[PDB]
């Protein structure tokens, strides 16, 4: 498979390079996907640009790692970038995408509020932990949940970061449990990673 970092950022005018590991041939492509839009091919055959793609975009490869460089970032270069490759005889695969933010305000760490299941929801025989994440920039986070000290992956839904009225970002994550499992642990935690550092909140039944 092809592996890309989840996010990257730089300021307007700067150069940035993002990588895609696991490439095994020269059938490498890159795609730019603006929010809410279809992808667009920006590089094919490692380093070729389709007509109309600005020359600020360039592709390269070193060993099994392909890279896309943008030389002179512009605000409208902010997008998710995917690498693609032919693999096997004739299959196509894609990397997981890198959200590239063009920095337009100071970086800001998230605030986190974790709500336990409400009494009304519990009385309805259901349970949802709600982790609300606010006031962060760039708009890219990862969320991990724990029951006591052990990771929990099942029953998790997380939204793509959404812009707040103050132009920082928010996100939400939900952990669905039975009332029984909620009561069977001493605590649950929601851990948010932003720019390589974490903020974690804990609640107890």
């Amino acid at each position: 498979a092809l592996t890309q970092p989840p996010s990257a950022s730089g300021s307007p005018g700067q150069s940035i390079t993002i990588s895609c590991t696991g490439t095994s041939n020269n059938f490498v492509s890159w795609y730019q996907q603006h929010a809410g839009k279809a992808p667009k091919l920006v590089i094919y055959d490692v380093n070729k640009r389709p007509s109309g793609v600005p020359d600020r975009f360039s592709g390269s490869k070193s060993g099994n790692t392909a890279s896309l460089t943008v030389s002179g970032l512009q605000t409208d270069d902010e997008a998710v970038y995917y690498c693609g490759s032919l693999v096997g005889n004739w299959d196509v695969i894609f990397g997981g995408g890198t959200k590239l933010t063009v920095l337009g305000q100071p970086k800001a760490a998230p605030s986190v509020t974790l709500f336990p299941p409400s009494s009304e929801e519990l009385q309805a025989n259901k349970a949802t932990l709600v982790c609300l994440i606010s006031d962060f920039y760039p708009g890219a986070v990862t969320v991990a949940w724990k029951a006591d000290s052990s990771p929990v992956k099942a029953g998790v839904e997380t939204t793509t970061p959404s812009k707040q009225s103050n132009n920082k970002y928010a996100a939400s994550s939900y952990l669905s449990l039975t009332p029984e499992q909620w009561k069977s642990h001493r605590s649950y935690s929601c851990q948010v990673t932003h720019e390589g550092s974490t903020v974690e909140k804990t609640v107890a039944p």
Partner: protein, 234 residues
Amino acid sequence: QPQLQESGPTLVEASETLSLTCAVSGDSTAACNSFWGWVRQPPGKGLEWVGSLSHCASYWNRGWTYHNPSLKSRLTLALDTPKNLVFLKLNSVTAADTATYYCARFGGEVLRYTDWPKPAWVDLWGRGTLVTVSSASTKGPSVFPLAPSSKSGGTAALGCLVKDYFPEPVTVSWNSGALTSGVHTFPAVLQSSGLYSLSSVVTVPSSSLGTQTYICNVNHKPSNTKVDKRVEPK
């Protein structure tokens, strides 16, 4: 320049068949320079190859069809070249098949090749069509309070969890619109149950919790439902 336009139903029940059509303009699906097919993308997730085909035969076949191996058992692709149409048929769909489906033209080592053509990249994309797989009927939300503690440096977050509704959308206001500062209403998530949920939050002064009532006003027009949920300190 050439264009690809998807059409077909955008809501498909679980276990049923998802079919889409793509109309190609400004290029010929009968020509041998490209393969024609599909890529999909679940909301908030990455791109996944579906497959592609060509009707340009070598001396040992009638054309070429390549499928994502994990979809092959459920997938049928076709071309109608006189009409310049590409088709997708995906049987027995589940929640995992909810996605934006993009019609796609593939380039690579296609016109000239060794052993077999190698369509490696998508050089033309349709705008995409989001197909939701859910067997849900219209259903108003179950609204639950996200209560603040009576005691974050003097502010209190409070909110409402708006669960298990269909179809979109719901809208949320606070105190009938008298409270707008610090309000954020999140995007909906489509759960594996085939129902949507979202939340809305507002941050207010903790000193207000004993004196000011907070009510979230949830509107779900598809079911002609409004819910005004009081959110009280714990």
